[PDB]
Amino acid sequence: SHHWGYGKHNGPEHWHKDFPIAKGERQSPVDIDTHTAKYDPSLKPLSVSYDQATSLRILNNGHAFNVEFDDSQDKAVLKGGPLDGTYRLIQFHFHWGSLDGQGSEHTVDKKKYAAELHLVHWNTKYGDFGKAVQQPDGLAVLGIFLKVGSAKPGLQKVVDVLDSIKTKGKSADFTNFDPRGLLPESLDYWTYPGSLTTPPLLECVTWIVLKEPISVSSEQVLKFRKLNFNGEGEPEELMVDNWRPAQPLKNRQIKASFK
Ligand SMILES: O=N[O-]
Ligand SMILES: [Cu+2]
Ligand SMILES: [Cu+2]
């Protein structure tokens, strides 16, 4: 509730105290050195099957907002790419900055983007998300960078509900949202084994990071920056800079799906 966040006193440099895996061997995010990632011809195209996605709700959970999905059947699934089996979409959320020069979690040759989107999926062979996060191949997260330029139409429905979930713990019905509207044109990706980027930082994630950023407008990101980390009736702290910086790559190889 205040033991981890992104403030001066509970930010990413502090998380290892409650979550020692923060200094682990497969932590995320990382800097993607484009000259050192190796093309792997064995990597298959990613299969994003979001046609039957059922969004249910949007929740300000105090660190970001999550758009949640019905995951009791195979409705919105990620397959292929580096993955074995079927991974069901459970939620997506973003990380963003106070200024356009920062906000993403992953970086590319040290470049920081203005924000980053994460679509979170779990492996169905484990039956539920809570069991899946306990497995090294339990989750697959699709990461997408945001830059400031032209507006992203498929984001505006998210932007316009944010006034109704300004503060922590507020939720709003959020049915019939189509996550395909947040994807860039190309599904070229880098992939590496990593972790959740918020506590509990479990090392259960196959990361799939798209090379092509999406563009959003200055006004859209300005509305993200009006959210609050705090609950209603508490001192206003703008929800900005909710990103973990790049972590050591250690004994990992980032593979590229492209030449
Ligand atoms: O928030 N990333 O798992
Ligand atoms: Cu806390
Ligand atoms: Cu995330």
From Swiss-Prot:
SUPFAM superfamilies: Carbonic anhydrase. Zinc. Can also use cobalt(II) with lower efficiency, but not copper(II), nickel(II) and manganese(II). Changing L196F: Normal activity. Changing W4A: Impaired activity, not rescued by 4-methylimidazole (4-MI). One of its GO terms (cellular component) is myelin sheath. One of its GO terms (molecular function) is arylesterase activity. Catalyzes the reversible hydration of carbon dioxide. Can also hydrate cyanamide to urea. Stimulates the chloride-bicarbonate exchange activity of SLC26A6. Essential for bone resorption and osteoclast differentiation. Involved in the regulation of fluid secretion into the anterior chamber of the eye. Contributes to intracellular pH regulation in the duodenal upper villous epithelium during proton-coupled peptide absorption. This is Carbonic anhydrase 2. It comes from Homo sapiens. The lineage of its organism: Eukaryota, Metazoa, Chordata, Craniata, Vertebrata. The gene is CA2.
